[PDB]
Every structure is written in structure tokens, then in C-alpha cells.
């Protein structure tokens, strides 16, 4: 019995998707609702939009964009070509917003239901879709990311802690460089890391939630995962004790590294996916490693939260759309019996209201 439920939702090649377009620069998945793929048919570039609730009927539209990212919740698409940004409501056939930058956007992502983040060579911007807003600069990029491929950007729930992630090759390995920025302190901290996420977590005896920052890295020393509270605790809160644990890589995965993280706040569990398809689950509170296995033989290049199950969903280079979540009726007896860790089993059981710690 496994503490997780693993599924394949779709094979994109069965929808006529050319495997040459299944990759980081042409396939986007900003949430579990849509997958967008940029393709060429003849001379015409097009975007293929797969509604994950009706996947066998994709929508194709002509475009002349170098990047397409769908809103997390609605059929509203952001398109760019060099410095030109345009936002379209698809169903209304209408251009909601347009903006011309003065720098190319090397990476962009929806960070909420109504805000797009833009990364240029020099800085990170936020652009709200409300009213007549234009992009607002959040911070200047730190020199430690100079030359990196930018692979992710994310924030905490209140958008006070911002995290830009890049990778490059140093000494024949893929080295991650992160920039953690505090909006309130206007200070950046460079960190060696590969994949990360924020989470809200309410400690027992604390009246307010803590804001936690979790990151995984394969460093020179080995793989490590860290879970640390950012900011001053809310007034009246105990500080969250920081955690640091090993991230395991088997001998034959000598060039693997972490590429994705999502955190379930329903289960207080961290999902970590490596470049070469390994899945890890960690307890958010203690950092204890719950489970590792391999879910993909092909590299996984994009993930999102899987909202229905509070899991993680992703696409691999073959075009399999795969998800992993906590199997709620197995996770506790797995932890009790296979990990032989009643302490954790009991804690998770009462903390997240899961069955199975009636016998330990």
C-alpha cells in the first residue's frame, strides 16, 4: 500500500500534439485547468488550448506570439512577442490589456488569479489585471543570477516574499541560484537552491499562521531540503523551528536535481519532483521524508498544484500528464508500519484529520 495515489490524466500525443512542442518553451501549464501549446502548422503559428475538464476538444487559435500563458482560473491568455504584451479574454474575443515593455521578458508566470509576473534580464515586475494597472517593478535581479536560465518565480500568499530561480552549469553540474526578496525590508538574499515553495502553516499553540519557505537543493555537499519561517513571527506566535534534512539521490542518478515543488496545506506535505522523474514526499512540519519512488522515465518540466486532491500535476517530455497526491486512507498506516514511525503517524493523523492511527 502506498502513501500516494499516482495517475496519468492524459497523453498529449493522442491529441495530435507533436512531441517537438512538448517542452519548457512551448508548453505551459499555469494551473491544473489548462495546458497551452504553441505549434506551427505550415506557415501559421497557433496555440492549442486544452481544457483539462474537456480535453478531447481542444481550442486552436492562430497566434504570432513567442510565449503563451493561460490564467489559472479563466480562459484569459497572456501572449507576448518581444516587448509587446497582450492579454485576451478568449470567449469575449477581446483584448483586455496591452503593454509595451522596454526590455524583453525572458520568463513570465501568473502568480495569482489576477497578477502576472514578468522577469527581464535586469528585474522582476508584477502586472495586475485590475483596472488600468501597468507593470510595477518589485526588485532588481541579484548578480548571482546573471547568465542563468530563469525557471521559476513564486511568492508567498500575501506577496511579501518573492523568489526568483535560475540555473546554469558550474563545474559540470546544474547549479541553482535563487533570489529571495522581502517586499517589506527591501532586501534580497541569494540562496543556492533548485526548487522551492512557500506555505502557510499554523503551529499548535500559535494564534496565527506562519509563513514558511521550503527549498530543496543538490549542492556540492549533497541534497538538502530546508523549511524555514520567513519574517518576524506574528505577534504572540512562537517561531517555527527551522528544519534541514537530506534529499536522497541514488548512485545512478548522479546528475539529477530537484525541478519542482508543490506543498499541500490540506495535508502539510511537501511534494518534490526531480528532473529525471523521482517523486519525494516530506512532512512540512518536521521535514521527515515519507516516501520516494520514481513516477516518470522522461524528464518533467512543468508542474502545478492539483487542486482537487491537493497534490501535484505535471507534464513530461513524452506528453504524459501525471499527478501525485496523498492517498488518505493509506498514508497513516504506511507511516506506522512501513516507516515504523508511529510518532509521525499519530501527529499527521490528528493534525490533518486522517484515518489509521487507531492502531499504532
Amino acid at each position: 500500500i502506498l502513501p500516494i495515489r499516482f495517475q496519468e490524466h492524459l497523453q498529449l500525443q493522442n491529441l495530435g500534439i507533436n512531441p517537438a512542442n512538448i517542452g519548457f518553451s512551448t508548453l505551459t501549464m499555469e494551473s491544473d485547468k489548462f495546458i497551452c501549446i504553441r505549434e506551427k502548422v505550415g506557415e501559421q503559428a497557433q496555440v492549442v488550448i486544452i481544457d483539462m475538464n474537456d480535453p478531447s476538444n481542444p481550442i486552436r487559435r492562430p497566434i504570432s506570439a513567442d510565449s503563451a500563458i493561460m490564467n489559472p482560473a479563466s480562459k484569459v491568455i497572456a501572449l507576448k512577442a518581444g516587448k509587446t504584451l497582450q492579454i485576451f479574454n478568449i470567449e469575449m474575443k477581446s483584448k483586455m490589456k496591452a503593454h509595451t515593455m522596454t526590455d524583453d521578458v525572458t520568463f513570465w508566470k501568473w502568480i495569482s488569479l489576477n497578477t502576472v509576473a514578468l522577469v527581464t534580464d535586469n528585474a522582476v515586475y508584477h502586472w495586475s489585471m485590475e483596472g488600468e494597472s501597468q507593470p510595477v517593478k518589485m526588485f532588481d535581479r541579484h548578480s548571482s543570477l546573471a547568465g542563468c536560465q530563469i525557471i521559476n518565480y513564486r511568492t508567498d500568499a500575501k506577496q511579501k516574499w518573492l523568489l526568483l530561480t535560475g540555473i546554469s552549469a558550474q563545474q559540470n553540474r546544474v547549479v541553482g541560484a535563487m533570489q529571495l526578496y522581502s517586499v517589506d525590508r527591501k532586501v534580497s538574499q541569494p540562496i543556492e537552491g533548485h526548487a522551492a515553495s512557500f506555505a502557510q502553516f499554523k503551529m499548535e499553540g500559535n494564534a496565527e499562521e506562519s509563513t514558511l519557505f521550503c527549498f530543496a537543493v543538490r549542492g556540492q555537499a549533497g541534497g538538502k531540503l530546508h523549511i524555514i519561517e520567513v519574517g518576524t513571527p506574528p505577534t504572540g506566535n512562537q517561531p517555527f523551528p527551522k528544519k534541514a534534512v537530506d534529499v536522497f539521490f541514488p548512485p545512478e542518478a548522479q546528475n539529477d536535481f530537484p525541478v519542482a515543488m508543490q506543498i499541500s496545506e490540506k495535508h502539510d506535505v511537501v511534494f518534490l519532483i526531480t528532473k529525471y522523474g523521482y517523486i519525494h514526499l516530506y512532512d512540512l512540519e518536521t521535514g521527515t521524508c515519507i516516501y520516494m519512488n520514481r513516477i516518470s522515465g522522461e524528464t518533467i518540466f512543468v508542474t502545478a498544484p492539483h487542486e482537487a486532491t491537493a497534490g501535484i500535476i505535471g507534464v513530461n517530455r513524452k506528453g504524459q500528464v501525471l499527478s501525485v497526491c496523498v492517498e488518505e486512507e493509506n498514508i497513516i498506516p504506511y507511516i506506522t508500519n512501513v516507516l515504523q514511525n508511529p510518532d509521525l503517524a499519530l501527529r499527521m493523523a490528528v493534525r490533518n484529520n486522517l484515518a489509521g492511527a487507531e492502531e499504532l
Binding site: 516574499w161 529571495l180 522581502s182 525590508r185 532586501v187 534580497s188 538574499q189 540562496i191 519557505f213 524555514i228 520567513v230
Partner: peptide, 4 residues
């Protein structure tokens, strides 16, 4: 100094 540090954020973390």
C-alpha cells in the same frame, strides 16, 4: 542581515 539575513532574510532566513
Amino acid at each position: 542581515l539575513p532574510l532566513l
